[PDB]
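The following block was generated as part of the benchmark described in Methods. Ligand: calcium ion.
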Amino acid sequence: DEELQTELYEIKHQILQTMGVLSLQGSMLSVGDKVFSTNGQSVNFDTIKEMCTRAGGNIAVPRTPEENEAIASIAKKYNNYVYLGMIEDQTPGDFHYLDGASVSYTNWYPGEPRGQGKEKCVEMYTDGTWNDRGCLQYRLAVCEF
Amino acid sequence: DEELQTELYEIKHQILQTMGVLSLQGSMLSVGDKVFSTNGQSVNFDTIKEMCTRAGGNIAVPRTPEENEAIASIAKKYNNYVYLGMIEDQTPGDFHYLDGASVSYTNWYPGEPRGQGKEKCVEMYTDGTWNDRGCLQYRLAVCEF
Amino acid sequence: DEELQTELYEIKHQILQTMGVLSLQGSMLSVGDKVFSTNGQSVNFDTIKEMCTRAGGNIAVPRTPEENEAIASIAKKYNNYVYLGMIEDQTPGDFHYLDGASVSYTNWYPGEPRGQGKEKCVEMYTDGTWNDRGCLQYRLAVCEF
Ligand SMILES: [Ca+2]
Ligand SMILES: [Ca+2]
Ligand SMILES: [Ca+2]
């Protein structure tokens, strides 16, 4: 009806106001349909995954250059490396998203992936490039929604 | 129409992104259809009620074990007791929600309600159990929306 | 349909919960259909405009007494003056919103606008009244959404 068109407009406006506020305050970065955010904590991979799922999201993983740059800006902001949502396959060198699917977009630092002790996790340097490492380090927790 | 199904999906996604961000940042706890949040202030009952209504919510009151535990986690988090949304009836011993209705779910500390000077308000200990007290103490303000 | 009426209700509830949380935490002030918010930064006019647009909003401009008072409360809160969304016309004395339209609601401090060196920008004193000044000062950035 006509009353429906009105309600949707207000609802859309309100969402746009709340997201604008969170953005202005630096609580989140929006890229396309994805929203990235961090709780400022620096913990290991398992802990990050838990924190994000508990917040109703998932450990962040860039799938485009723009997404990768948004996460990179957060890592730079906190002067810390970020663990990404991906892990090495059974056969070293290959990586897959946490759902199993194989990674498509990649931004490895030159020479990487270079598995010392079978580097299973992936960290993002502050310049945005990736390094495959182990998963017990303390890294900035960044989630995507 | 079909364009309507699309709009609703995006709107639902966005809300889920903003709530995810607030959750990740510890600004609010969601339990079922209820959201709890605190402004970190420790003031008396009247002041808490005003703050919550002014924010478009109400002084929190647990109606299920899960809700009670969520509030308890916030009280523990701030290492302070929380005033709950309920007050003693005209006849001591009985308590009612702020709308008048009688309390159903209760989690009194053993021995409570124990009205010294006609304990009218109800505070939540950090372990989640309740104690009926007076209303002039300074307690953590927790609201529900 | 009937399932639509239900979805809208939940969506409206959720938005009301997120806005309630932001309000309680002092992250934003709602006035009618307008939301004001600040990132706590004190920068010049050009910088403020950029910050707000980047957040999906615009440098704040009061169009009613109530809106003016809400912004005034924020300026008082941070003990700093706020640059408003308006600039002086080609012919001194006249001011227009950033879209070109001429200002309607005004709250000039007695004697203002008083253009010393052709005061082009407008700042809000902590009492809510306005003073036309230059645009290079460092003022609290307040956006509207
Ligand atoms: Ca490596
Ligand atoms: Ca007692
Ligand atoms: Ca002047």
